[PDB]
């Protein structure tokens, strides 16, 4: 295989789930673990417990590829931001730095309209 | 004629020595058409706030020309056909 | 707009005398030349739709002064009418 000394916790933290993609500094997701990856789907995909489970599974894969030092790259808001953060902290990946990597269309494109249920 | 304070961003690839002769070789037409007194203030090797065209540093040029709007318009048309130039900005010193 | 120099030379030209800015013929000439100026600004800004209101207001003021010119003395009225070539 290979070893990644420093990783990046690219957390696609959708309210649906926190896809914790660990990425080498090159910019390649060496592995990822989401709520479904642990086994959480539907509402359980969006439960806070799924967040630390996904983060911990990703960090276990990180150790499996010898990853210890990771800076945290959290995407948009979801379920279990700080939860996945201290999961990664408690799973062999120290926090390093936290960065809210969220897209900012500064009054740009048009989305769908809305939901009323 | 209006006082236009033309701001130009130039490539980081070239040397600062060539920065100026490339500047009078284009200010020549402005001077020959509008009779424009030009104050060429050049200060290069400065970073851009965001990377532009795969580059985040360049050369900053301030030129104070007293030229009619047509002449500075010709300059802007020429201040973008060049590879060295990066961003042009012609400003109306009036209350505009 | 009515540049501070062109309006002054126009006042000297068609005004009743010096310093008599605001005399009916003087204002007529000033607003007439302003209207001629806007004539082509509208023809290039075909969808300006906002300076036309000032166009009409100045035209109305020109006519509202033309009537006062005619009532005081028809002679000066005709003089200015064929001077500016109106109608």
């Amino acid at each position: 295989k290979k070893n990644v000394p420093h990783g990046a916790a690219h957390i696609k933290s959708t309210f649906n789930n926190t896809i914790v993609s660990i990425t080498d500094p090159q910019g390649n997701v060496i592995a990822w673990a989401s709520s479904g990856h642990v086994g959480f789907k539907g509402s359980r995909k969006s439960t806070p417990f799924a967040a630390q489970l996904a983060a911990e599974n990703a960090a276990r894969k990180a150790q499996e590829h010898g990853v210890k030092k990771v800076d945290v790259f959290v995407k948009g808001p979801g379920s279990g931001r700080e939860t996945a953060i201290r999961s990664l902290q408690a799973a062999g990946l120290e926090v390093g730095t936290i960065s809210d990597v969220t897209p900012q269309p500064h009054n740009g494109c048009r989305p769908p309209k809305r939901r009323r249920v | 004629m209006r006082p236009y304070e033309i701001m130009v961003i130039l490539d980081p690839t070239l040397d600062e020595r060539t920065v100026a002769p490339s500047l009078e070789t284009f200010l020549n037409v402005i001077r020959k058409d509008g009779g424009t007194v030009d104050k060429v203030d050049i200060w290069g090797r400065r970073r851009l706030a965001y990377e532009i065209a795969k580059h985040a540093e360049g050369i900053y040029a301030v030129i104070d020309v007293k030229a009619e709007p047509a002449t500075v318009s010709e300059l802007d048309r020429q201040l973008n056909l060049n590879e060295s130039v990066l961003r042009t900005k012609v400003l109306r010193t009036d209350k505009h | 707009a009515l540049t501070a120099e062109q309006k002054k030379e126009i006042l000297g030209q068609y005004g009743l005398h010096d310093t008599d800015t605001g005399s009916p013929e003087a204002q007529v000439a000033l607003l007439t030349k302003r209207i001629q100026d806007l004539t082509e600004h509208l023809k290039v800004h075909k969808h300006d739709h906002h300076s036309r209101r000032g166009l009409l207001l100045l035209v109305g003021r020109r006519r509202r002064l033309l009537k006062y010119v005619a009532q005081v003395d028809v002679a000066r009225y005709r003089s200015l009418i064929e001077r500016l070539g109106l109608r």
Partner: protein, 64 residues
């Protein structure tokens, strides 16, 4: 803040877009813009500074 201004009251000072340091004193970390009344300055200076900050963001000298 709470003065007449730092320009309209100090009665000597200027604003330049090239003076990116002076403008940066009023911008946020990313470059976000203070409200019309945050810095306690006379309004015209606020508006002109806002337009200058727009231009600076366009010319890539402030953190956008």
């Amino acid at each position: 803040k709470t003065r007449k201004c730092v320009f309209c009251s100090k009665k000597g000072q200027t604003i330049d877009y090239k003076d990116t340091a002076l403008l940066r004193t009023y911008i946020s970390e990313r470059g976000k813009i203070r409200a019309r009344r945050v810095t306690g300055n006379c309004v015209q200076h606020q508006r002109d500074i806002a337009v200058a900050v727009k231009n600076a963001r366009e010319v890539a000298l402030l953190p956008f």
